[PDB]
A and B are shown apart, each in its own frame.
Chain A
């Protein structure tokens, strides 16, 4: 009914959205925190996935009501875009389970874990839509002051990423045919760089590299570690301290 249907949808959306969405997503988060709970799923596994599919049907009804709803400004909310993506993945996995047959592997495959973390995203969305009331103003102000200095921390993490990529490149270049079994590829190289970055067994790296024949890589590793460590942590600590400090200087 065009704009008339839109205004009816606005009023009845306020009323019914409040009542129904709050009650059914409260029950959804109840059954979903009962679901994960890796002791009670053996006291279950048969009343769990059926209620999971029932409340996924409730969620696809939510997305249907939002699709027949006002439309373009609905997409202008990033949380609503996350709803749309989550529901696209939900109808995808629901029809994938529904068609059966198939020709690929199943019985708790990696794709099943992808659907499980999609269910985790759905649970997080349920949690975020039950906190419309009483987020508490103290932590609201704390988070608002925390999120004030976004460009500074994004620039600092960009510098971290560039420095870490450079260090990984030079280390993998210097670790060729030097028992690279721990860092034979790019993922393991960046993970080992993360371990050096996070004070995790770099002394062990020194002691099992001393068992090897190369030594200068150890001064190279400590000098890179200390410069990136001191520079990054001093930068972030100082930046966030001053970021809350000018808000302290106000009321």
Chain B
């Protein structure tokens, strides 16, 4: 069961497009900086 309270609003992307997952750092009052490190993405339950 998907939802929004613990999974957020899903994306409504159309047919095949290019997306880069890019993330920024934020604390307390607001955002600090853009994040550059080394990521890993992974699915909740499992696909290939």
Are A and B direct contacts in the complex by CB distance below 8 Å?
no
Residues of chain A having any CB pair with chain B under 8 Å:
none
